[model samples]
Target: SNSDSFQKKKLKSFTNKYVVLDSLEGLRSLPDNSVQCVVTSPPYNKLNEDDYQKWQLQILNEINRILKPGGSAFYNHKDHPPEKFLSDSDLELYQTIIWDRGSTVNQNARYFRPYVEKIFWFTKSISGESTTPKFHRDRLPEYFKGVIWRIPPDKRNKHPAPFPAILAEICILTTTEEGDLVLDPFAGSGTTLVAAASLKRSYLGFDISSKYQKMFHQRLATSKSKVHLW
Candidate 1:
């Protein structure tokens, strides 16, 4: 399923309508408040122990800029404190989502092997500008029974860092209206793009390596189809 191209090709990312080759630094180039939502797994510089806090601040600033008044950003951070989340932008845009990756790995002489992760949830405004979406109302019918655990072993992987495709689907369905653009800044292997494509959303993603980009693009190209889709 990773590279086979004859499978289906539904709304596979490349098959979808847009794929931009740009950096988040090009923020103003993209319209102010243009994006409906952003859900991405950024580098765990915290886990890697980088002292450059500026990177996080820059990202937070850009996210605040591109998001519409009602837009949202679902960012993955490695258990940094909520206080560290402050970056001069509107603090109200900050929130959290618990992600139980269902695995563990201890740090150098630290406590028990770490497992869970924190996805920073940010929104631009309140009122008609609110960004959080109701996940229950948007679940794929197949998972309506809460059979997420029943997902096929082949469909699931035991990687130390794996994204929940079901979770990605919910993100697509809820935060965005059909045809609104969604973005994943650190799109490892492109799961977010694939999920967005399948659920009838426009997606843009970038990776540090061409190999990872190709891996997910190939998968999407051969996956199933959706609406006028893309």
Candidate 2:
């Protein structure tokens, strides 16, 4: 059991907060079945459709590998391609939650104003076994039960695109318990990390941009006394 002992030694080196510059690198370093939940939104706008799908698929596989059986991943995106590509990964889609951003930022005539984004809930099942994923409906309030969530975009964060902390909070709270490890590979503005921290969960985040990393730290500092509506 030398490998197992080695893995244990390596895992011990992980701090409560592990932030790295590369998403895949950070993901690959983790041991199998180590994380309890993952809440993240990849930068889809940066790559073309095909490239984005390929890149995301790779990350999804790594996420599936690192997640404990019955662990969940909440992926946030504004389009439908994830629905297609997620089917191609090892993780199974549990549900799709819509974030109705109350209003649209892009008010173009070419298409209907995009006011909503999709949070794809994917779970890792036990190998060759059918099992239910970890979920706690009681963690959510009455109004938060449905598929559609009417939350507004976060205008206060300096990141070009930042979803509200409440959105991340809902995902983390529903899928994870206190002190469970939650990871955000894209970690933009560290919204997911902040949410995990606020909920007393251990958090790991990765983002290549130094600007966003700094913003993440600043937001985490000021959010100590932040309160959620529900």
Candidate 3:
């Protein structure tokens, strides 16, 4: 009911444990400082390098604004594919976790087969004007090194580039507690929502393509009905 109101103003989104919506405009429908955690694998830039960087920075800045103080974001991006992708950082960049995929899709005769991805762990701080956010480190696996995460690629999904459930699960487990709200701004085929549902976390996901919306719903039907939506 409440979730319905959240998106109805101009909603392209849906769900209970999850909220699925359309692109950047969907982010705007959210209230300020509402999200507890974020994990997104934005589409690769097709534009010029500088343009791409600037575009990501701008979206990141918006992400920063909506995040509560001390909340974390896991930004999944490719490592240098003979070109640097999101290698620089500042106040929001707390750390970078290497994700060794153990396989490579982009085979190039000119270069080595790259099998790693990078997850930029960005956290918003408690500021004078912001409410303090929460994270429970005790919830993390004791053996977790707080560094590299090894996950294999998820190949069955129809999305051209789909994030693995393990990747989404790890990010959720590490950054947030049960019932905390999580978001994926680029909700490519619903991996985030699937992970969030399994973990008892509330979730929101957005994508630009209706093709994915159909795919996502088909997935939801196969998923547990314990999940609800707008």
Candidate topping TM-score: 2
TM-score per candidate: 0.68, 0.89, 0.77
Model 3 worst lDDT run, 10 consecutive residues: 82-91
Clashing residue pairs found in predicted model 1: 8-222, 9-222, 9-223, 10-223, 10-224, 10-225, 12-220, 106-113
Instruction: Indicate which candidate wins on lDDT.
Output: 2
* Model 1: residues with Cα > 4 Å off, grouped in runs: 1-22, 45-51, 79-83, 105-113, 125-162, 225-230
Q: What are the per-model C-alpha RMSD values against the true structure? A: 9.2, 2.3, 5.6
Q: Which ten-residue region of model 1 has the weakest summed lDDT?
A: 145-154
Candidates ranked, most accurate by lDDT first: 2, 3, 1
Candidate 2 structure quality by residue, lDDT tens digits, 160-199: 7777888888888887889898899888888888888888
lDDT of 3 by residue, 99-160 (tens): 88888778986888788777878776444233333555565564445577666777777888
Ranking by TM-score: 2, 3, 1
lDDT of 3: 0.69
Q: Write the per-residue lDDT of candidate 1 for residues 51-110, one digit (tens) a residue.
A: 445666666677676676667777766545544645444524445566655654456556
**Which residue pairs show backbone clashes in model 3?**
13-20, 15-229, 15-230, 16-228, 16-229
Candidate 1's C-alpha lDDT? 0.58
